[PDB]
Amino acid sequence: HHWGYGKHNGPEHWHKDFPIAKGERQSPVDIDTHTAKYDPSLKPLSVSYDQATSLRILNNGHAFNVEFDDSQDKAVLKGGPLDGTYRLIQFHFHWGSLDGQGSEHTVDKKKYAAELHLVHWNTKYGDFGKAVQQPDGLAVLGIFLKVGSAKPGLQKVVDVLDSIKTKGKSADFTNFDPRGLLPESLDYWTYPGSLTTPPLLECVTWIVLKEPISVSSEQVLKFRKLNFNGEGEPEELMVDNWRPAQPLKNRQIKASFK
């Protein structure tokens, strides 16, 4: 709770507390769409969110986390590059100060206005805390946001943010359907990587959807009204909470589509 996104505590500093920041499988990365190899071996991706059950939303001083009840076999990601089954625990976003930046992954160096991360843990390790200690512990579905038409399924999120403005505030947040945040297509890129915030663990199979979602300007402007600070400290708007692209280091990015 000293790391952040600023000049003196941002991404270029994180390696001091977290040496893995300079590791061999760090995220995000630029997705070079011409270099990515179509992989006919990938099985169909399966997103089964019909029983997802949200519990709460928290401003953690970095982003806001929508946390789900993951105590039962509900809200599962499987197939694609995955072996076994991964359970949804939370989602969050990364976004910019301006529409021209905000995403963590880039596509041929293109930055989107924001990116959504749906975080799932491998059920073979029994819970999230043990899964993050394993190289195949997590599967994160990444979805790019562009500014245009509103996303009606985002509006419940946008409307609770005024209740969690500052670091440490949380609220009850039930019956949120994450299916309303998906694009039409499940075409994706996949590669082995890491968490994009400290502790930067190399435990993620990344699945980045090719098709962005559209959100309105007014929706992302409400993201940018959150605060990094806690109440009673100077106001610092919660913007630019994205780590830039890291070295690919001879990993391969595979495409699900030709």
Nearer to Ni ion, 1 or 34 (CB): 1
CB neighbours of 123 closer than 8 A, spacing ≥ 6?
A: 73, 84, 85, 86, 87
> Distance (Å, rounded) from C-alpha 19 to C-alpha 199?
9
Give min distance, CB of 243 to Ni ion, in A.
8
Beta strand 37-38 with 254-255: parallel, antiparallel or unpaired? Answer: parallel
Size of the site for Ni ion (CB under 5 A): 5
Give min distance, CB of 34 to Ni ion, in A.
26
Report which secondary-structure segment, H or E, holds 195: none
Residue 94 labelled as part of a binding site: yes
Which residue from 2, 7, 8, 16 is in contact with Ni ion, where contact means CB under 5 A?
Answer: 2
Helix segments in the chain, DSSP class H = 128-131, 155-160, 217-223
Binding flag, residue 151, Ni ion (CB under 5 A): no
Nearer to Ni ion, 85 or 196 (CB): 196
Give min distance, CB of 117 to Ni ion, in A.
4
Contact range with Ni ion by CB under 5 A, out of 73-81, 116-124, 163-171, 210-218: 116-124
Q: For residue 161, which phi and psi values (nearest 5 degrees)?
A: -60, -30
Coil vs helix vs strand at 235: coil
Nearer to Ni ion, 39 or 199 (CB): 199
> Distance (Å, rounded) from C-alpha 90 to C-alpha 106?
22
Given the residues 13, 62, 105, 120, select the one marked as catalytic. Answer: 62
Nearer to Ni ion, 51 or 106 (CB): 106
Site for Ni ion in 179-208 (CB under 5 A): 196
Residue 92 labelled as part of a binding site: yes
Which residue from 62, 87, 117, 222 is in contact with Ni ion, where contact means CB under 5 A?
Answer: 117
Coil vs helix vs strand at 124: helix
Return the structure tokens found at 146: 């562009």
Catalytic, 62? Answer yes
Beta strand 37-38 with 45-48: parallel, antiparallel or unpaired? Answer: unpaired
Give min distance, CB of 136 to Ni ion, in A.
18
Q: For residue 11, which phi and psi values (nearest 5 degrees)?
A: -45, -35
Give min distance, CB of 2 to Ni ion, in A.
3
* Position of minimal CB gap to Ni ion: 2
Nearer to Ni ion, 26 or 196 (CB): 196
Q: What is the DSSP letter of 184?
A: S
Binding flag, residue 37, Ni ion (CB under 5 A): no
* Other beta carbons within 10 Å of 69: 16
Report which secondary-structure segment, H or E, holds 232: none
List, as residue ranges, the binding site for Zn(2+). Answer: 92, 94, 117
Per the annotation, where are the binding residues for substrate? 196-197
Binding residues: 92, 94, 117, 196-197
* Contact footprint for Ni ion (CB under 5 A): 1-3, 117, 196
Write out the catalytic residue numbers.
62
